[PDB]
Structure 1
């Protein structure tokens, strides 16, 4: 029953676009329209290295869902050379059936001392993203991150 509901949600779920903006200035640094949320294939993303100098970035995800969800949410694990560097939890909440929604998250930079150079990070960062509706796992996907 839970297996069937997770299948139904993923079948009706679509990631339309995503972008990253500098939080202070609002200028779009990167935009993707690929469904980087597809579970089977490891996706690649090439983001400008100036992203690392931003005091904070705003990430916007636009998605559609045929199925209603009560507590739509995300868990992200950031791996650097296979070691978990960071863990993030984001909550959207209630998704109206057949709706299309924009979800904005603010991600503030660590102090300058703890920031890692683009030359060290590039190609060695994997972002594993799990999409959930409460405690129900809908999908897992991975993106390999390059800084160019």
Structure 2
């Protein structure tokens, strides 16, 4: 192992996702909320979202996290797979994280204008979100969530 592998593990160790929610960006209405740390790697998490989320033009996510470790450029890469095929890739930057801080991170997730959504009934249980946590180019964790539309 290198210093960077050790550092990634230290960050993971100090990290906790405390709560999260999703809102319709246009109306502000709450679609989903949870307190399960979906960032925990090595386990396939599940989440149930209302099927009307697929009609939204944009979704606002609020994500609350704690970190014992300082981070220079905290960021996420998320890949949206349907039956193993990547259909969307999202990138979000938080930036600098104070050691032993708790932070609320708001992001906007926008519908790709190129594409049209398959129906909820087709998508449900066949969508995996793969999320990669980075400090800059240091990969901290990789986690998966399987989505159901209800």
Structure 2 spans left out of the alignment, 5+ residues: none
Q: Residue 113 and residue 38 in structure 1: after superposition, are their counterparts in 2 closer, same or farther (change >3 A)? A: closer
Q: TM-score, normalising length from structure 2?
A: 0.95
User: Residue by residue, what CA displacement relative to the aligned partner does 1:30-79 show, whole Å, maximum 9, x if unpaired?
Assistant: 00110111101100000000111112110111100010000000011111
Secondary structure of 2:102's counterpart equals strand
Q: TM-score, normalising length from structure 1?
A: 0.96
Q: Deviating runs (4+, > 6 A) in structure 1? A: none
Q: Residue 79 and residue 98 in structure 1: after superposition, are their counterparts in 2 closer, same or farther (change >3 A)? A: same
Cα distance between partner residues in 1 of 2:149 and 2:114: 17
Cα distance between partner residues in 2 of 1:111 and 1:89: 17
RMSD (CA atoms): 1.2
User: Residue by residue, what CA displacement relative to the aligned partner does 1:96-134 show, whole Å, maximum 9, x if unpaired?
Assistant: 111111111111223496122111110000000010001
Structure 1 spans left out of the alignment, 5+ residues: none
Cα distance between partner residues in 1 of 2:117 and 2:13: 38
Match of 2:44 among 38, 42, 45: 42
Q: What is the CA-CA distance between 1:95 and the residue it aligns to?
A: 0.4
Match of 2:21 among 19, 22, 26: 19
Aligned residues: 148
